[PDB]
């Protein structure tokens, strides 16, 4: 006769991600790279968001 | 642009009087600290004086009870009166706003003193 014995399926062996294009840069450079700092008493607190 | 304007400086003999002037324009938030600076040809920048929003007044040992800082509220300026004065004060100055964020210092204002 016939017999269903198993299941077929096909695995995959590579994995795919999109995002969309990374678009709003951080204020880092204005922070990091800074030509001047605040002294220390007059600390330079920047909120980034 | 934070823009401090210095002004009333010259050649004035010995015991001569004036009045030097910080107008302050920009930013500045409403606590800030208007201060004023010596240098004189070869040496760093000598601390004078200081005013902040209490209108509280503090000068240096150099020239105690000579110098006077007053304060005007309502365009938020200072005036130095520069009296009594003695050649060790031949030195250009700068007034330093220390506000909250980036500090801004000024173009200079010639004070000289001699016979
Ligand atoms: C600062 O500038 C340098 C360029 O030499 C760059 O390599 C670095 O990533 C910058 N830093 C930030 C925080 O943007």
């Known amino acids: 006769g016939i017999y269903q014995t198993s299941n077929f399926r096909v695995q995959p062996t590579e994995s795919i991600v999109r995002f969309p294009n990374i678009t709003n840069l951080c204020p880092f450079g204005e922070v990091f790279n800074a030509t001047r700092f605040a002294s220390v008493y007059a600390w330079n607190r920047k909120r980034i968001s | ?115």
Request: aromatic share 10%.
């Open chain 2, 1 to 115: 642009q934070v823009q401090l304007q210095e002004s009333g400086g010259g050649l004035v003999q010995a015991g001569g009087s004036l009045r030097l002037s910080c107008a302050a324009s920009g930013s500045i938030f409403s606590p800030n600290t208007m201060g004023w600076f010596r240098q004189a040809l070869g040496k760093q920048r000598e601390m004078v004086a200081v005013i902040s929003s209490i209108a509280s007044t503090q000068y240096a040992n150099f020239v105690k009870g000579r110098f006077t800082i007053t304060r005007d509220n309502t365009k938020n300026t200072v005036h130095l009166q520069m009296n009594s004065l003695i050649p060790e004060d031949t030195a250009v100055y700068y007034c330093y706003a220390v506000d909250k964020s980036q500090d801004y210092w000024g173009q200079g204002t010639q004070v000289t003193v001699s016979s």
